[PDB]
Amino acid sequence: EVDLEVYDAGVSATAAVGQDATNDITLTIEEGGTTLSSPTGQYVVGSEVDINGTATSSDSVAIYVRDDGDWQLLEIGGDNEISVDSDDTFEEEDIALSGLSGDGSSILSLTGTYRIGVIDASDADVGGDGSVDDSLTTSEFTSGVSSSNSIRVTDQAL
């Protein structure tokens, strides 16, 4: 909870530290939920799917995949980010997760149950150039605003 205190007219800045406020107003500060919707539940290996989700307070978002270790970055392509509209919603076209180049995609190639999460631009190369180019660990991924959901890949039969 965050408060704002006003003071009577003519009071000085230094002398206003001790005098009580004439009135007040309070507001609450939390962090917005940035979650994914479509890459959840099931995924056929080699298939293409869109990236669907929402982000209340975000400008650039990145998608990471984890399996018994580091969160390997998934190279979605252009600028490795997705913009967010005024409706606090971000979307991407149909992307083949395993098809795309990068070591992040290589984890999802093999059949199993994994985890996929999204993170805001708060990383920014964990400090440095304005680009998402790292493999954030558990502490780094969790420290910023993020969310992850369980995903498993199934085999493809024509």
Binding site: T113, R115, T142
Partner: protein, 249 residues
């Protein structure tokens, strides 16, 4: 009044822990909770209690080390001062919850035993004879994530752990876990003698007892030996059960 939600008396993810706190704190404006381990690391957080004195703060992360962690809940009493206001480094009578946090920062900096912090925290705030503040004590072993399968048996009455299951009747499987009941899930796999999966079920709910049960049907199953596999993104446990046309009774 306070409470701590432990899946089995432990918190599974050491890197990113999570506990739920709720209780009744009538007459107070804020409540402070502190976590200290055996080494002596301290983590604190303040909780804004609502008007009717029923505070409930959920998903509290713990950034301590693996081992045993004891938890305390602080509440300023009538004086609205931490105890008598006699902080070793803080001012006199201005000892609030935020003021005591500054004293906590000095505790972990010095090479102090975790047990010493228990003596210091109780002595400086509660053990003082003129103190009016109240605390509650709770402990839990901060361990790593672990999942295992305990008992597999049909709808009959059995608790040994292993029981042949006749096809056509549903069989229950029971295992133990330390993960969060909702934020995680357990996926099962049943495979035959040559890697033909036949069943796949998942559960994402279980009470604070730690026991989870998964239901799979045996309508189209074939007699023989079948492999049961359960994973949660961590170490995977495997158990084998036999399938028979009819059982002996």
């Amino acid at each position: 009044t306070g409470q701590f939600t432990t899946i089995n008396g432990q918190v599974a993810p050491v890197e990113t822990g999570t506990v739920d706190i709720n209780g009744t704190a009538s007459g107070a404006n804020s409540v402070l909770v502190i976590f200290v381990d055996e080494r002596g690391n301290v983590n604190y957080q303040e909780v804004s209690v609502d008007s009717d004195g029923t505070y409930d703060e959920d998903d509290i992360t713990v950034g301590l080390t693996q081992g045993r962690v004891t938890a305390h809940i602080l509440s300023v009493g009538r004086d609205s001062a931490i105890g008598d206001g006699s902080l070793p480094s803080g001012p006199s009578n201005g000892a609030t919850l935020n003021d005591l946090t500054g004293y906590l920062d000095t505790l972990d900096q010095n090479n102090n035993n975790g047990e010493q912090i228990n003596e210091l925290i109780a002595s400086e705030t509660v053990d003082e004879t003129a103190s009016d503040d109240l605390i509650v004590t709770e402990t839990f072993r901060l361990a790593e994530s672990s999942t295992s399968i305990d008992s597999i048996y049909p709808d009959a009455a059995e608790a040994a752990g292993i029981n042949p299951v006749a096809t056509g009747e549903t069989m229950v499987i029971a295992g133990s876990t330390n993960l969060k009941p909702d934020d995680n899930t357990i996926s099962i796999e049943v495979t035959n003698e040559d890697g033909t999966s036949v069943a796949l079920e998942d559960t994402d709910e279980w009470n604070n007892d730690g026991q989870w049960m998964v239901e799979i049907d045996t309508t189209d199953f074939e007699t023989g030996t079948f492999t049961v596999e359960a994973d949660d993104g961590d170490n995977t446990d495997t158990v084998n059960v036999e399938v028979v046309s009819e059982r002996e009774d």
